[PDB]
Amino acid sequence: YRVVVLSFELLHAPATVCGPKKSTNLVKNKCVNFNFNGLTGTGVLTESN
Amino acid sequence: SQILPDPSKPSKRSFIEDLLFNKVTLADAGFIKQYGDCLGDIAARDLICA
Numbered sequence: 001y002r003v004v005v006l007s008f009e010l011l012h013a014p015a016t017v018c019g020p021k022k023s024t025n026l027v028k029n030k031c032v033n034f035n036f037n038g039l040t041g042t043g044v045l046t047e048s049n
Numbered sequence: 050s051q052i053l054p055d056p057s058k059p060s061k062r063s064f065i066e067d068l069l070f071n072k073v074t075l076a077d078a079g080f081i082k083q084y085g086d087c088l089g090d091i092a093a094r095d096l097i098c099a
């Protein structure tokens with residue numbers, strides 16, 4: 001039996017192995033349901049210092 | 050004069066009452082100070098801190 005096992009860590013910054021989903025542009029200052037490399041949530045994206 | 054209200058200020062507190070207000074503070078507080086800081090951050094719009 002040819003056995004191949006996959007191992008990967010989760011919730012980390014260097015996301016160079018990822019899926020085929022299409023990226024969209026930012027809107028800023030709007031209540032949106034964003035997603036960042038699998039990290040998703042509902043909120044408003046603004047600037048920062 | 051120390052306990053009577055002061056008409057020289059918009060607040061009607063006395064001098065002793067002003068000292069009492071200045072003594073109690075929320076300097077090292079947690080959620081309360083963070084919630085009160087959103088009311089001082091009214092210059093930035095779209096701040097739904099409720």
Ligand SMILES: *[C@@H]1O[C@H](CO)[C@@H](O)[C@H](O)[C@H]1NC(C)=O
Pocket residue numbers: 091092093094095096
């Ligand atoms: C509410 O709107 C007024 C006028 O547009 C503004 O002066 C005030 O800072 C706003 N409050 C907040 C919490 O954004």
